Structure formats: structure tokens, C-alpha cells
Amino acid sequence: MKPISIIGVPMDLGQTRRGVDMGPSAMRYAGVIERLERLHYDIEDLGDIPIGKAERLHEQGDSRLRNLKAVAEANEKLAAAVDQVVQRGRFPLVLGGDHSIAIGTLAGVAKHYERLGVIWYDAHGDVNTAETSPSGNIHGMPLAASLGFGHPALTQIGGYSPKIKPEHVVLIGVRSLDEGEKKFIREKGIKIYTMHEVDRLGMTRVMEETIAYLKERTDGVHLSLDLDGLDPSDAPGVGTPVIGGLTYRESHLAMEMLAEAQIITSAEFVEVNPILDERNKTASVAVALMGSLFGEKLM
């Protein structure tokens, strides 16, 4: 198996902080390195991408895009870092705060694939644009931006766009969308398994369908896992908790299936928030999930 390179991006740049910047530190504390070493991986921790400060009481920036400069600049550096990791033939594993970092991760990865697919495991769709976002928070726009729909500053990160096509994205666990997002998912024809579908189909079927779909049409698959995809009972420490989510068992099963499938070529675990967490529980859950993603088997 190829070596892994961890990159942490302690970003918490929404209009107001959510504590997710501490995510990387918490997951490191939970033992992500050690967990992966036990699985016999050659893994390195490149450290963290530097993040600019958020907008003070009065600074320059776009109303419709909170902390656009800092967000874009951080993502530009991440894109470079991720690109290099891939260049070196290593698997990039990005740990983060804001899901906004998916813009940077996909920017560095996508250029290396003809048809890169994406499994967006999240409670939210993240397909807002400056036009549709009620808040202007870029963390609610990473998927749209990566599809080539968003502010120029975000869609062009890495020097190109789009990074992926809508037919190569599969949303899982979604249970919170803005009307514009519903319209977007709908009009762009993005495959999506809302909690409703998981309830009616069961995670095993959802995963089999997802894996088969992407496998038959992509040459690499990126897993963008937002911990809030899980229910707050299992993952209390997240930036924006939403009730009615995926259980740890469903998520653990999903990771094992992806592992077996061997389709994931890059991944990122984001939005861990120590402020709402209980004794680093969520960070530990993230690490266990990474463990399964990377081959850990119960027998």
C-alpha cells in the first residue's frame, strides 16, 4: 500500500467561530498517527497549513463571503501541499476544521485524475453560493465551489475548474439543506442519499450502490467526511450538529466497505469541534473511522 501524509488545516473562518479549528489537534490527541502505524503504514504528519486571522470589527472583505481572503489563501496553500503529496505517490489525509478546506484538498487532488469521484458524507449539502447562502459562510459552499459554481476566488483555487463533475459526486447523510441547495442538487443532478433513503434502504445497500456507481465511472475517489454526518449522540463535538444522523455503526460499516472496495484515493475528516465534545469522544470516533477506512478489520 502507498504511504500516507497527514495535513492538518486548523480553519474556523465562518462569520463567527465554531471551535472546529481545534479539530486536527483533537484527532492527533485521539491517536490518528499511532492507529495508522499499527496497520503498518508508512505515514507522516506534515503539520498544519497556516491560517490567516478572521475579519476584525472592521476589515476589507466581501459581505457575501465571510473571510474570503484568508479562506482562499489557506486553501491555495493546502492545494499545493496536497498536490505534492500526490506527486510523491502518497495518500493525502487532510484533517480539519471548516469543511471549506475541501476546496483546497480537491484542488490538489483532482488535477491528477481524469474522472475524480467524491463521496460527500455530511449532514449538509455544502452547495451554497454567495448568491444562495443565507450566512455567507464559505464552509457551506465547498462542494458547489469545487463543481465550478461559486465565487471566482473559490472556484479557481489551484488554477483550474471545475475539479469534479456532478455525475461523480454522491452525497450521504444529508438532512439539512437551504432551498437553493435543494434546487442546486436537483438541477445539477447530484446523487444523494438523505437520511430518508438510509432509513428505507439501510447503509449496506446505500454503500453498495454508491461504491458501484462511482467505481463504474471514475479513476479515483475522494472521501470528504464531515463528522456532523453522524448523529450528535455519537459525534457531539462538531461545528454544526444536526439531529437525526448516521450512527457510528453505520459509519463504521461504511468505512469497512470502502476499505474492501479499494476505491478511496484521498480523504479528509473535518469539522471536529472540541468545545461541544465529551472527553474527546468525537475525535476518537474520527480515528476509529480512519482506522476502518485504512484496513482495520474486526476479525
- Minimum distance from CB of 156 to a second copy (Å)? 24
Instruction: State which residue, 124 or 222, has the beta carbon closest to Mn ion.
Output: 124
**Among the listed residues 17, 64, 112, 182, the single contact to a second copy using CB under 8 A:** 182
**125: annotated binding-site residue?**
yes
- Minimum distance from CB of 290 to Mn ion (Å)? 17
Which amino acid, residue 208? E
**Among the listed residues 263, 285, 286, 293, the single contact to a second copy using CB under 8 A:** 285
How many Å apart are CA 114 and CA 85, to the nearest integer? 18
Q: Are strands 91-96 and 169-174 parallel, antiparallel or unpaired?
A: unpaired
How many Å apart are CA 174 and CA 184, to the nearest integer? 14
Strands of 91-96's sheet in order across: 43-48, 4-9, 91-96, 264-270, 220-226, 116-121, 169-174, 191-194
**Among the listed residues 44, 45, 55, 167, the single contact to a second copy using CB under 8 A:** 167
**Among the listed residues 58, 63, 278, 299, the single contact to a second copy using CB under 8 A:** 299
Q: Which does 88 bind (CB under 5 to 8 A by kind): Mn ion, a second copy, none?
A: none
**98: annotated binding-site residue?**
no
Q: How far apart are the first and last CA of the chain?
A: 20
Q: Which of 228, 234, 277, 296 is catalytic?
A: 228
How many Å apart are CA 110 and CA 166, to the nearest integer? 14
How many Å apart are CA 169 and CA 210, to the nearest integer? 9
How many Å apart are CA 299 and CA 297, to the nearest integer? 5
Q: Which does 2 bind (CB under 5 to 8 A by kind): Mn ion, a second copy, none?
A: none
Q: Containing H/E element for 264?
A: strand 264-270
**174: annotated binding-site residue?**
no
**Among the listed residues 86, 157, 185, 225, the single contact to a second copy using CB under 8 A:** 185
Does 178 engage in binding with a second copy (CB under 8 A)? no
CA angle 108-112-115, nearest 5°? Answer: 110
271 is catalytic: yes
Instruction: State which residue, 33 or 39, has the beta carbon closest to a second copy.
Output: 39
CA angle 275-55-20, nearest 5°? Answer: 20
Q: Which of 12, 48, 126, 231 is catalytic?
A: 126
Q: Which of 73, 99, 250, 256 is catalytic?
A: 99
- Minimum distance from CB of 48 to a second copy (Å)? 27
**226: annotated binding-site residue?**
yes
Q: What are phi and psi of 240, to 5 degrees?
A: -130, 85
**67: annotated binding-site residue?**
no
How many Å apart are CA 130 and CA 214, to the nearest integer? 29
- Minimum distance from CB of 113 to Mn ion (Å)? 22
Alpha-carbon distances of 129 from 50, 89, 166, 174, 261, rounded to whole Å: 25, 34, 15, 18, 33
Instruction: State which residue, 88 or 200, has the beta carbon closest to a second copy.
Output: 200
Q: Which residues are catalytic?
A: 99, 122, 124, 126, 139, 226, 228, 271
Q: Which residues would be at the binding site for a second copy (CB under 8 A)?
A: 167, 174-177, 182, 185-187, 189, 192, 194-196, 199-200, 203-205, 208-209, 213, 216-217, 231, 233-234, 243-244, 248-250, 252-253, 256, 284-285, 288, 298-299
As annotated, the binding site for Mn(2+) includes 99, 122, 124, 126, 226, 228
